[PDB]
Amino acid sequence: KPLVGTGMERAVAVDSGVTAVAKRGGVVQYVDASRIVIKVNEDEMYPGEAGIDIYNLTKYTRSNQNTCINQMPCVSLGEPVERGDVLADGPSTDLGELALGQNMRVAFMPWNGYNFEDSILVSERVVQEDRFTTIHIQELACVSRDTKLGPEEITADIPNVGEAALSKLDESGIVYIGAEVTGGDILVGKVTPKGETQLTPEEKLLRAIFGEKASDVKDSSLRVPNGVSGTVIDVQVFTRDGVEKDKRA
Amino acid sequence: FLKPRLVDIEQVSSTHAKVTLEPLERGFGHTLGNALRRILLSSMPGCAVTEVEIDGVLHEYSTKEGVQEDILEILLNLKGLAVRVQGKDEVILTLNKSGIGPVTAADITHDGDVEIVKPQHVICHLTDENASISMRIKVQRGRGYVPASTRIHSEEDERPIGRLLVDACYSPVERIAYNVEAARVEQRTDLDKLVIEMETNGTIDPEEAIRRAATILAEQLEAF
Amino acid sequence: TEFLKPRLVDIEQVSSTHAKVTLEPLERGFGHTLGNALRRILLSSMPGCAVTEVEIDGVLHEYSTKEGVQEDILEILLNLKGLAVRVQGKDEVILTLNKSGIGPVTAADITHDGDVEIVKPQHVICHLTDENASISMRIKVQRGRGYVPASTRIHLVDACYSPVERIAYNVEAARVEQRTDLDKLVIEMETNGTIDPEEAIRRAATILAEQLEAFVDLEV
Amino acid sequence: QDVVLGLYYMTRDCVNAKGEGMVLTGPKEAERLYRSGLASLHARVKVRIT
Amino acid sequence: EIKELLKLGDLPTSGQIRLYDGRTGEQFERPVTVGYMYMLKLNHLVDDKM
Amino acid sequence: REEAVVWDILDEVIREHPVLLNRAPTLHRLGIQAFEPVLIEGKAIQLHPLV
């Protein structure tokens, strides 16, 4: 929350749709991290269809900037709620106000030139408390195309990968929901046909000695971009209408 | 050259206390007090939760039906669960509960070396009549700050995808403040006192702390 | 949960009186506590003997001019401070400056006592001008566990006891294998010649260890 | 910037400060006078230099 | 108003207090301003920029 | 694989090998300056204050 405010932040928090605002006043029947169910007062209530106002909260999902947008309930079980009151906080909003960051203890003084120009010198207490930590949500895609050499397979059978590589994938070639990955990990196995490598003499000798069959298939599999690491919160499979959906899908 | 020794160790709250060192020579109250501040805040034994495996959960970013806390917030709440052991360097606690109401730190399954210093400490709430959360809360012991990130180098089949690593909080110490007040033993020219007022989660006794602190301090002098 | 200990890898010492020693690898944050603690101890409290007071044979005052000496008396006092005096079991000793002539008075021109040892016969006390130039006097030293200024003798010469003429510590990053960031702590120190720097460190931290003997256990 | 504020604060003189008027053998015991808290960083003082 | 609220706080009017270097433990000369400043993390984050 | 042994080899190839550092508005020739690389844990470049 801002410790030093203005009094506008409340208005920004509410007017912007990031929060979840009560349609009608009443008592809270149910509070889940998923949803919030409110029992309406009669004076605000329409005669027909009785009612309760059910609010389905947005859960962890990809924002436009590749940040995370997630709503949290600010109310508890069986609480009075006025009409036009905040039922849930959006990202960067606290208790119905706008918190775009965090307030902290700050001291103005040169410290060993580590603050030199505009530079900022921050205690380990902050990085430990995980307060300035941020959750990014990235959307990666794997495209199965059609090449004149043949169609591309999403199959989990990938030329030249260890059992450790094919472990995080199911039988169908897609990564399990929830598996934490890093750079180099294969999210989706994809292989495209390229036949007749047309190798050279020494390579042919090598193959003659080691008796390896050079595959007619090339590895196009979508892998996590180098250096970035996180957890898988969802997977979607779009299929051309009429093509047989694989096992995973 | 009179060597110092401690004196009354006054417990105020389960949280913090003021310890004291009586026989201090010229300027040595600072020479000691600051070094001791340093070693106290930094290097200390502590036991914090590391790996948590919950009921139906693949990852910390989902929600469990029947509890208003997101898995992320629950893990964060667990990181702040203070415990203490005796004869084990890792102990795996068992948490079970159901029914509508708060799930506190006392709802776990007590073990031989388990001591819950804050039984009222909140894990997460329970919003529905029949909903039940079971978790194996793996709590080990160590030093300093080990983030969940640096934890995977070793790896070696961490495959139980339901296992969520959290950052290591290990440390008893919250705040250390030393004061040097002139202390007059009944007869001497001039001497000072070291009042070391520390702050803890209650998982370490003051004398234990200050002792192992001084211990490591001298242990670095081993050069000669 | 086992702990890291170093031992000094390099002692790089210029001449005799001066020494610069490197110590590593340390734990993160330990370089500054070691360095600072040892620095405060080395500086503010050390055993040593120097000149507390000197009677002036010529005059009674610090502000005056001697016959045969262009040095103001305070300048001579300065030189007196820089005299290296290491005394034996004799707790207090007094010497005499006896010499006169056209030549500069050195520290070898002082009288020789039994328990007295001067480290520098070269040390310049005062110059003598032409002819006779009446000079000689008696110098009274003392003992101290710290550094005691001139005004601090309340009820005049600054008493410089601690052998250390300077102490500095550079804490820079140290690398060990798979251990990311460590402390490489470099102590540099100067002495007045009485005790060599190397053992001066040893006794200095022996003081600390003694201060700590009332607490620890185990490793021993 | 920071550095010059450092050197400026270093060599400057106030009217009255710890160690005012006294005298020292050289820069070594001057620094030693300062770090021990006996003498103030800025005080008018005669010292021998080479 | 701010100083008046600082009085209610038990904290000085100057907004500055005594601070000590966590390294040497010795006091910093002069008072320094300490307070609570609301701060934002913009997303320029370096593991993007690199 | 970033095996443990490669970091030392990198410390070998880095030693006497300078690198060129440059900023966005290059005007005078000092806009580019050569430095001796020092291996640092982080994603940020560290540049001497006097420069």
PDB file of N, CA, C and O in Angstrom, chain B residues 1-6 21 24-25 27-28 30-32 34-35 38-39 42-43 142-143 211 214-224, chain C residues 1-7 26-27 29-30 32-34 36-37 40-41 45 145 202 205 207-208 210-217 219:
ATOM      1  N   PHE B   1      44.806  -6.761  32.248  1.00  0.00           N
ATOM      2  CA  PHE B   1      43.873  -7.099  31.177  1.00  0.00           C
ATOM      3  C   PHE B   1      42.787  -8.059  31.659  1.00  0.00           C
ATOM      4  O   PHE B   1      42.929  -9.276  31.549  1.00  0.00           O
ATOM      5  N   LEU B   2      41.704  -7.501  32.192  1.00  0.00           N
ATOM      6  CA  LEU B   2      40.593  -8.301  32.695  1.00  0.00           C
ATOM      7  C   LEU B   2      39.680  -8.769  31.567  1.00  0.00           C
ATOM      8  O   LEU B   2      39.109  -7.956  30.840  1.00  0.00           O
ATOM      9  N   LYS B   3      39.552 -10.085  31.424  1.00  0.00           N
ATOM     10  CA  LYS B   3      38.640 -10.662  30.444  1.00  0.00           C
ATOM     11  C   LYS B   3      37.208 -10.535  30.954  1.00  0.00           C
ATOM     12  O   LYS B   3      36.964 -10.625  32.158  1.00  0.00           O
ATOM     13  N   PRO B   4      36.253 -10.312  30.044  1.00  0.00           N
ATOM     14  CA  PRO B   4      34.871 -10.155  30.498  1.00  0.00           C
ATOM     15  C   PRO B   4      34.176 -11.488  30.730  1.00  0.00           C
ATOM     16  O   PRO B   4      34.732 -12.545  30.444  1.00  0.00           O
ATOM     17  N   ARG B   5      32.952 -11.412  31.235  1.00  0.00           N
ATOM     18  CA  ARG B   5      32.090 -12.566  31.416  1.00  0.00           C
ATOM     19  C   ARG B   5      30.674 -12.021  31.412  1.00  0.00           C
ATOM     20  O   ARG B   5      30.462 -10.843  31.690  1.00  0.00           O
ATOM     21  N   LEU B   6      29.699 -12.862  31.094  1.00  0.00           N
ATOM     22  CA  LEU B   6      28.328 -12.381  31.068  1.00  0.00           C
ATOM     23  C   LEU B   6      27.774 -12.194  32.477  1.00  0.00           C
ATOM     24  O   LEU B   6      28.437 -12.486  33.472  1.00  0.00           O
ATOM     25  N   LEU B  21      27.214  -8.191  29.230  1.00  0.00           N
ATOM     26  CA  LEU B  21      28.589  -8.586  29.545  1.00  0.00           C
ATOM     27  C   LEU B  21      29.247  -7.542  30.452  1.00  0.00           C
ATOM     28  O   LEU B  21      29.516  -6.420  30.026  1.00  0.00           O
ATOM     29  N   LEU B  24      34.159  -5.032  31.052  1.00  0.00           N
ATOM     30  CA  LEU B  24      34.729  -4.593  29.781  1.00  0.00           C
ATOM     31  C   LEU B  24      35.768  -3.485  29.916  1.00  0.00           C
ATOM     32  O   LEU B  24      35.542  -2.491  30.602  1.00  0.00           O
ATOM     33  N   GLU B  25      36.900  -3.671  29.240  1.00  0.00           N
ATOM     34  CA  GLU B  25      37.993  -2.701  29.244  1.00  0.00           C
ATOM     35  C   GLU B  25      37.726  -1.523  28.311  1.00  0.00           C
ATOM     36  O   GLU B  25      36.617  -1.362  27.797  1.00  0.00           O
ATOM     37  N   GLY B  27      37.166   0.812  25.438  1.00  0.00           N
ATOM     38  CA  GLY B  27      36.769   0.741  24.044  1.00  0.00           C
ATOM     39  C   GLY B  27      36.343  -0.638  23.571  1.00  0.00           C
ATOM     40  O   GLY B  27      35.838  -0.783  22.459  1.00  0.00           O
ATOM     41  N   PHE B  28      36.529  -1.649  24.415  1.00  0.00           N
ATOM     42  CA  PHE B  28      36.281  -3.030  24.013  1.00  0.00           C
ATOM     43  C   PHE B  28      34.800  -3.370  23.944  1.00  0.00           C
ATOM     44  O   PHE B  28      34.418  -4.390  23.372  1.00  0.00           O
ATOM     45  N   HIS B  30      32.644  -1.711  22.249  1.00  0.00           N
ATOM     46  CA  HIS B  30      32.327  -1.579  20.831  1.00  0.00           C
ATOM     47  C   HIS B  30      32.993  -2.678  20.011  1.00  0.00           C
ATOM     48  O   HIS B  30      32.359  -3.296  19.149  1.00  0.00           O
ATOM     49  N   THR B  31      34.275  -2.907  20.290  1.00  0.00           N
ATOM     50  CA  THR B  31      35.080  -3.896  19.579  1.00  0.00           C
ATOM     51  C   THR B  31      34.415  -5.261  19.628  1.00  0.00           C
ATOM     52  O   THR B  31      34.430  -6.015  18.655  1.00  0.00           O
ATOM     53  N   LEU B  32      33.821  -5.563  20.775  1.00  0.00           N
ATOM     54  CA  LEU B  32      33.056  -6.789  20.947  1.00  0.00           C
ATOM     55  C   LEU B  32      31.644  -6.646  20.396  1.00  0.00           C
ATOM     56  O   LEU B  32      31.246  -7.401  19.520  1.00  0.00           O
ATOM     57  N   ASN B  34      30.029  -4.825  18.273  1.00  0.00           N
ATOM     58  CA  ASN B  34      29.797  -4.753  16.831  1.00  0.00           C
ATOM     59  C   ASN B  34      30.130  -6.053  16.103  1.00  0.00           C
ATOM     60  O   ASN B  34      29.382  -6.488  15.228  1.00  0.00           O
ATOM     61  N   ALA B  35      31.256  -6.662  16.462  1.00  0.00           N
ATOM     62  CA  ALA B  35      31.635  -7.955  15.907  1.00  0.00           C
ATOM     63  C   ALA B  35      30.544  -8.975  16.200  1.00  0.00           C
ATOM     64  O   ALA B  35      30.124  -9.735  15.327  1.00  0.00           O
ATOM     65  N   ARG B  38      27.559  -8.456  14.126  1.00  0.00           N
ATOM     66  CA  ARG B  38      27.850  -9.010  12.811  1.00  0.00           C
ATOM     67  C   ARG B  38      27.616 -10.510  12.751  1.00  0.00           C
ATOM     68  O   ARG B  38      26.844 -10.995  11.924  1.00  0.00           O
ATOM     69  N   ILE B  39      28.288 -11.243  13.629  1.00  0.00           N
ATOM     70  CA  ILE B  39      28.206 -12.695  13.599  1.00  0.00           C
ATOM     71  C   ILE B  39      26.824 -13.167  14.033  1.00  0.00           C
ATOM     72  O   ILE B  39      26.344 -14.202  13.570  1.00  0.00           O
ATOM     73  N   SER B  42      24.313 -12.622  10.956  1.00  0.00           N
ATOM     74  CA  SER B  42      24.663 -13.374   9.759  1.00  0.00           C
ATOM     75  C   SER B  42      24.625 -14.882   9.960  1.00  0.00           C
ATOM     76  O   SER B  42      23.738 -15.562   9.449  1.00  0.00           O
ATOM     77  N   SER B  43      25.593 -15.402  10.707  1.00  0.00           N
ATOM     78  CA  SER B  43      25.792 -16.839  10.764  1.00  0.00           C
ATOM     79  C   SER B  43      25.227 -17.424  12.045  1.00  0.00           C
ATOM     80  O   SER B  43      25.808 -17.275  13.117  1.00  0.00           O
ATOM     81  N   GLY B 142      19.646 -25.439   8.785  1.00  0.00           N
ATOM     82  CA  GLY B 142      20.790 -24.889   8.077  1.00  0.00           C
ATOM     83  C   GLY B 142      21.145 -23.467   8.479  1.00  0.00           C
ATOM     84  O   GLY B 142      20.694 -22.970   9.513  1.00  0.00           O
ATOM     85  N   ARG B 143      21.958 -22.810   7.654  1.00  0.00           N
ATOM     86  CA  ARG B 143      22.453 -21.469   7.964  1.00  0.00           C
ATOM     87  C   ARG B 143      22.295 -20.500   6.796  1.00  0.00           C
ATOM     88  O   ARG B 143      22.401 -20.889   5.633  1.00  0.00           O
ATOM     89  N   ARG B 211      26.822 -17.521  22.705  1.00  0.00           N
ATOM     90  CA  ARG B 211      27.920 -18.460  22.902  1.00  0.00           C
ATOM     91  C   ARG B 211      28.477 -18.900  21.567  1.00  0.00           C
ATOM     92  O   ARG B 211      29.642 -18.656  21.283  1.00  0.00           O
ATOM     93  N   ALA B 214      30.298 -15.987  19.753  1.00  0.00           N
ATOM     94  CA  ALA B 214      31.672 -15.818  20.234  1.00  0.00           C
ATOM     95  C   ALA B 214      32.574 -16.968  19.778  1.00  0.00           C
ATOM     96  O   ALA B 214      33.752 -16.770  19.460  1.00  0.00           O
ATOM     97  N   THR B 215      31.995 -18.166  19.756  1.00  0.00           N
ATOM     98  CA  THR B 215      32.674 -19.379  19.320  1.00  0.00           C
ATOM     99  C   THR B 215      33.242 -19.224  17.922  1.00  0.00           C
ATOM    100  O   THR B 215      34.449 -19.338  17.735  1.00  0.00           O
ATOM    101  N   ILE B 216      32.373 -18.992  16.944  1.00  0.00           N
ATOM    102  CA  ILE B 216      32.807 -18.771  15.565  1.00  0.00           C
ATOM    103  C   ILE B 216      33.807 -17.620  15.475  1.00  0.00           C
ATOM    104  O   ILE B 216      34.804 -17.702  14.737  1.00  0.00           O
ATOM    105  N   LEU B 217      33.537 -16.553  16.233  1.00  0.00           N
ATOM    106  CA  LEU B 217      34.430 -15.397  16.262  1.00  0.00           C
ATOM    107  C   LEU B 217      35.860 -15.839  16.549  1.00  0.00           C
ATOM    108  O   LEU B 217      36.771 -15.523  15.789  1.00  0.00           O
ATOM    109  N   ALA B 218      36.047 -16.579  17.638  1.00  0.00           N
ATOM    110  CA  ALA B 218      37.374 -17.066  18.001  1.00  0.00           C
ATOM    111  C   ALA B 218      37.878 -18.098  16.999  1.00  0.00           C
ATOM    112  O   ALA B 218      39.078 -18.203  16.742  1.00  0.00           O
ATOM    113  N   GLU B 219      36.942 -18.849  16.433  1.00  0.00           N
ATOM    114  CA  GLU B 219      37.241 -19.930  15.508  1.00  0.00           C
ATOM    115  C   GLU B 219      37.899 -19.386  14.245  1.00  0.00           C
ATOM    116  O   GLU B 219      38.635 -20.097  13.562  1.00  0.00           O
ATOM    117  N   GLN B 220      37.635 -18.118  13.939  1.00  0.00           N
ATOM    118  CA  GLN B 220      38.304 -17.470  12.809  1.00  0.00           C
ATOM    119  C   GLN B 220      39.744 -17.033  13.123  1.00  0.00           C
ATOM    120  O   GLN B 220      40.548 -16.826  12.215  1.00  0.00           O
ATOM    121  N   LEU B 221      40.048 -16.881  14.410  1.00  0.00           N
ATOM    122  CA  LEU B 221      41.390 -16.498  14.864  1.00  0.00           C
ATOM    123  C   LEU B 221      42.401 -17.634  14.748  1.00  0.00           C
ATOM    124  O   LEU B 221      43.585 -17.465  15.051  1.00  0.00           O
ATOM    125  N   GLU B 222      41.911 -18.792  14.318  1.00  0.00           N
ATOM    126  CA  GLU B 222      42.693 -20.025  14.252  1.00  0.00           C
ATOM    127  C   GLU B 222      43.949 -19.902  13.375  1.00  0.00           C
ATOM    128  O   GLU B 222      44.803 -20.787  13.400  1.00  0.00           O
ATOM    129  N   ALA B 223      44.062 -18.807  12.625  1.00  0.00           N
ATOM    130  CA  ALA B 223      45.219 -18.551  11.767  1.00  0.00           C
ATOM    131  C   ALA B 223      46.548 -18.805  12.493  1.00  0.00           C
ATOM    132  O   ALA B 223      47.421 -19.512  11.978  1.00  0.00           O
ATOM    133  N   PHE B 224      46.678 -18.250  13.699  1.00  0.00           N
ATOM    134  CA  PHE B 224      47.884 -18.419  14.519  1.00  0.00           C
ATOM    135  C   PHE B 224      47.670 -19.254  15.784  1.00  0.00           C
ATOM    136  O   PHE B 224      48.635 -19.611  16.466  1.00  0.00           O
TER     137      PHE B 224
ATOM    138  N   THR C   1      25.944 -28.458   8.747  1.00  0.00           N
ATOM    139  CA  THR C   1      26.204 -27.021   8.769  1.00  0.00           C
ATOM    140  C   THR C   1      27.609 -26.721   9.293  1.00  0.00           C
ATOM    141  O   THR C   1      27.778 -26.247  10.420  1.00  0.00           O
ATOM    142  N   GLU C   2      28.611 -26.969   8.458  1.00  0.00           N
ATOM    143  CA  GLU C   2      30.004 -26.838   8.873  1.00  0.00           C
ATOM    144  C   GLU C   2      30.672 -25.583   8.309  1.00  0.00           C
ATOM    145  O   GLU C   2      30.332 -25.114   7.219  1.00  0.00           O
ATOM    146  N   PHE C   3      31.626 -25.051   9.067  1.00  0.00           N
ATOM    147  CA  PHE C   3      32.110 -23.686   8.874  1.00  0.00           C
ATOM    148  C   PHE C   3      33.488 -23.568   8.233  1.00  0.00           C
ATOM    149  O   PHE C   3      34.344 -24.441   8.381  1.00  0.00           O
ATOM    150  N   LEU C   4      33.680 -22.467   7.515  1.00  0.00           N
ATOM    151  CA  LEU C   4      34.860 -22.261   6.696  1.00  0.00           C
ATOM    152  C   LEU C   4      35.935 -21.524   7.481  1.00  0.00           C
ATOM    153  O   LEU C   4      35.667 -20.490   8.089  1.00  0.00           O
ATOM    154  N   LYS C   5      37.152 -22.058   7.468  1.00  0.00           N
ATOM    155  CA  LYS C   5      38.274 -21.365   8.085  1.00  0.00           C
ATOM    156  C   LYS C   5      39.404 -21.192   7.077  1.00  0.00           C
ATOM    157  O   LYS C   5      39.701 -22.106   6.307  1.00  0.00           O
ATOM    158  N   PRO C   6      40.042 -20.013   7.079  1.00  0.00           N
ATOM    159  CA  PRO C   6      41.219 -19.765   6.250  1.00  0.00           C
ATOM    160  C   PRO C   6      42.510 -20.005   7.019  1.00  0.00           C
ATOM    161  O   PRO C   6      42.486 -20.361   8.197  1.00  0.00           O
ATOM    162  N   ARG C   7      43.626 -19.804   6.328  1.00  0.00           N
ATOM    163  CA  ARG C   7      44.928 -19.586   6.941  1.00  0.00           C
ATOM    164  C   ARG C   7      45.658 -18.668   5.977  1.00  0.00           C
ATOM    165  O   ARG C   7      45.421 -18.728   4.767  1.00  0.00           O
ATOM    166  N   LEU C  26      37.681 -16.218   3.259  1.00  0.00           N
ATOM    167  CA  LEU C  26      36.778 -16.036   4.393  1.00  0.00           C
ATOM    168  C   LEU C  26      35.330 -16.314   4.022  1.00  0.00           C
ATOM    169  O   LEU C  26      35.009 -16.559   2.862  1.00  0.00           O
ATOM    170  N   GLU C  27      34.457 -16.256   5.019  1.00  0.00           N
ATOM    171  CA  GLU C  27      33.022 -16.291   4.785  1.00  0.00           C
ATOM    172  C   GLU C  27      32.539 -14.893   4.412  1.00  0.00           C
ATOM    173  O   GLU C  27      33.174 -13.902   4.773  1.00  0.00           O
ATOM    174  N   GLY C  29      31.057 -11.462   4.575  1.00  0.00           N
ATOM    175  CA  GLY C  29      30.809 -10.548   5.674  1.00  0.00           C
ATOM    176  C   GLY C  29      31.831 -10.645   6.790  1.00  0.00           C
ATOM    177  O   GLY C  29      31.919  -9.755   7.632  1.00  0.00           O
ATOM    178  N   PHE C  30      32.612 -11.718   6.798  1.00  0.00           N
ATOM    179  CA  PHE C  30      33.560 -11.946   7.887  1.00  0.00           C
ATOM    180  C   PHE C  30      34.830 -11.101   7.776  1.00  0.00           C
ATOM    181  O   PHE C  30      35.505 -10.835   8.780  1.00  0.00           O
ATOM    182  N   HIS C  32      35.108  -7.941   6.987  1.00  0.00           N
ATOM    183  CA  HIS C  32      34.920  -6.632   7.594  1.00  0.00           C
ATOM    184  C   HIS C  32      34.877  -6.676   9.120  1.00  0.00           C
ATOM    185  O   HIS C  32      35.397  -5.777   9.777  1.00  0.00           O
ATOM    186  N   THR C  33      34.272  -7.715   9.689  1.00  0.00           N
ATOM    187  CA  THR C  33      34.255  -7.837  11.146  1.00  0.00           C
ATOM    188  C   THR C  33      35.643  -8.164  11.688  1.00  0.00           C
ATOM    189  O   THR C  33      36.097  -7.534  12.645  1.00  0.00           O
ATOM    190  N   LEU C  34      36.317  -9.133  11.069  1.00  0.00           N
ATOM    191  CA  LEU C  34      37.709  -9.423  11.406  1.00  0.00           C
ATOM    192  C   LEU C  34      38.564  -8.161  11.330  1.00  0.00           C
ATOM    193  O   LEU C  34      39.139  -7.724  12.330  1.00  0.00           O
ATOM    194  N   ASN C  36      37.876  -4.895  11.012  1.00  0.00           N
ATOM    195  CA  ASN C  36      37.497  -3.803  11.910  1.00  0.00           C
ATOM    196  C   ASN C  36      37.819  -4.073  13.375  1.00  0.00           C
ATOM    197  O   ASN C  36      38.372  -3.212  14.057  1.00  0.00           O
ATOM    198  N   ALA C  37      37.461  -5.258  13.863  1.00  0.00           N
ATOM    199  CA  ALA C  37      37.732  -5.607  15.255  1.00  0.00           C
ATOM    200  C   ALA C  37      39.231  -5.573  15.536  1.00  0.00           C
ATOM    201  O   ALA C  37      39.689  -4.871  16.450  1.00  0.00           O
ATOM    202  N   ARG C  40      40.523  -1.962  15.523  1.00  0.00           N
ATOM    203  CA  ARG C  40      40.210  -1.197  16.727  1.00  0.00           C
ATOM    204  C   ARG C  40      41.109  -1.633  17.875  1.00  0.00           C
ATOM    205  O   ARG C  40      41.637  -0.797  18.615  1.00  0.00           O
ATOM    206  N   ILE C  41      41.289  -2.943  18.013  1.00  0.00           N
ATOM    207  CA  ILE C  41      42.192  -3.467  19.034  1.00  0.00           C
ATOM    208  C   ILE C  41      43.632  -3.011  18.814  1.00  0.00           C
ATOM    209  O   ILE C  41      44.235  -2.411  19.701  1.00  0.00           O
ATOM    210  N   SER C  45      44.070   0.004  21.696  1.00  0.00           N
ATOM    211  CA  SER C  45      44.732  -0.654  22.823  1.00  0.00           C
ATOM    212  C   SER C  45      45.888  -1.604  22.452  1.00  0.00           C
ATOM    213  O   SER C  45      45.669  -2.690  21.916  1.00  0.00           O
ATOM    214  N   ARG C 145      48.409   0.856  28.094  1.00  0.00           N
ATOM    215  CA  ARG C 145      47.662  -0.205  27.429  1.00  0.00           C
ATOM    216  C   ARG C 145      46.864   0.286  26.225  1.00  0.00           C
ATOM    217  O   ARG C 145      46.103  -0.469  25.625  1.00  0.00           O
ATOM    218  N   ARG C 202      49.378 -11.044  16.210  1.00  0.00           N
ATOM    219  CA  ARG C 202      49.153 -12.222  17.047  1.00  0.00           C
ATOM    220  C   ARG C 202      48.732 -11.866  18.471  1.00  0.00           C
ATOM    221  O   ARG C 202      47.748 -12.396  18.985  1.00  0.00           O
ATOM    222  N   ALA C 205      45.229 -10.008  18.602  1.00  0.00           N
ATOM    223  CA  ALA C 205      44.052 -10.871  18.566  1.00  0.00           C
ATOM    224  C   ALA C 205      44.069 -11.896  19.692  1.00  0.00           C
ATOM    225  O   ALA C 205      43.063 -12.556  19.957  1.00  0.00           O
ATOM    226  N   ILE C 207      44.542 -10.808  22.590  1.00  0.00           N
ATOM    227  CA  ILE C 207      43.717  -9.987  23.469  1.00  0.00           C
ATOM    228  C   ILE C 207      42.235 -10.307  23.273  1.00  0.00           C
ATOM    229  O   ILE C 207      41.509 -10.539  24.239  1.00  0.00           O
ATOM    230  N   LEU C 208      41.806 -10.332  22.014  1.00  0.00           N
ATOM    231  CA  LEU C 208      40.426 -10.650  21.649  1.00  0.00           C
ATOM    232  C   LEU C 208      40.035 -12.046  22.131  1.00  0.00           C
ATOM    233  O   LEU C 208      38.989 -12.233  22.763  1.00  0.00           O
ATOM    234  N   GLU C 210      41.321 -13.740  24.477  1.00  0.00           N
ATOM    235  CA  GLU C 210      41.210 -13.698  25.931  1.00  0.00           C
ATOM    236  C   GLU C 210      39.882 -13.086  26.352  1.00  0.00           C
ATOM    237  O   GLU C 210      39.258 -13.540  27.311  1.00  0.00           O
ATOM    238  N   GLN C 211      39.448 -12.062  25.626  1.00  0.00           N
ATOM    239  CA  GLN C 211      38.158 -11.438  25.891  1.00  0.00           C
ATOM    240  C   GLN C 211      37.018 -12.433  25.680  1.00  0.00           C
ATOM    241  O   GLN C 211      35.951 -12.309  26.282  1.00  0.00           O
ATOM    242  N   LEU C 212      37.262 -13.421  24.821  1.00  0.00           N
ATOM    243  CA  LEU C 212      36.249 -14.415  24.460  1.00  0.00           C
ATOM    244  C   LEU C 212      36.320 -15.748  25.223  1.00  0.00           C
ATOM    245  O   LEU C 212      35.501 -16.635  24.984  1.00  0.00           O
ATOM    246  N   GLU C 213      37.282 -15.890  26.134  1.00  0.00           N
ATOM    247  CA  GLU C 213      37.540 -17.178  26.793  1.00  0.00           C
ATOM    248  C   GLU C 213      36.435 -17.571  27.780  1.00  0.00           C
ATOM    249  O   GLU C 213      36.404 -18.692  28.293  1.00  0.00           O
ATOM    250  N   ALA C 214      35.522 -16.642  28.028  1.00  0.00           N
ATOM    251  CA  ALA C 214      34.483 -16.824  29.029  1.00  0.00           C
ATOM    252  C   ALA C 214      33.195 -17.390  28.431  1.00  0.00           C
ATOM    253  O   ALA C 214      32.188 -17.519  29.129  1.00  0.00           O
ATOM    254  N   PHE C 215      33.231 -17.730  27.146  1.00  0.00           N
ATOM    255  CA  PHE C 215      32.004 -17.996  26.402  1.00  0.00           C
ATOM    256  C   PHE C 215      31.924 -19.354  25.681  1.00  0.00           C
ATOM    257  O   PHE C 215      31.062 -20.176  25.997  1.00  0.00           O
ATOM    258  N   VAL C 216      32.815 -19.586  24.721  1.00  0.00           N
ATOM    259  CA  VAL C 216      32.696 -20.722  23.803  1.00  0.00           C
ATOM    260  C   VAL C 216      32.957 -22.127  24.376  1.00  0.00           C
ATOM    261  O   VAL C 216      33.189 -22.312  25.579  1.00  0.00           O
ATOM    262  N   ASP C 217      32.879 -23.106  23.473  1.00  0.00           N
ATOM    263  CA  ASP C 217      33.057 -24.530  23.763  1.00  0.00           C
ATOM    264  C   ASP C 217      33.393 -25.276  22.469  1.00  0.00           C
ATOM    265  O   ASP C 217      33.740 -24.654  21.464  1.00  0.00           O
ATOM    266  N   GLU C 219      35.012 -26.875  19.467  1.00  0.00           N
ATOM    267  CA  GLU C 219      36.163 -27.103  18.578  1.00  0.00           C
ATOM    268  C   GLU C 219      37.542 -27.054  19.253  1.00  0.00           C
ATOM    269  O   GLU C 219      38.403 -27.893  18.970  1.00  0.00           O
TER     270      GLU C 219
END
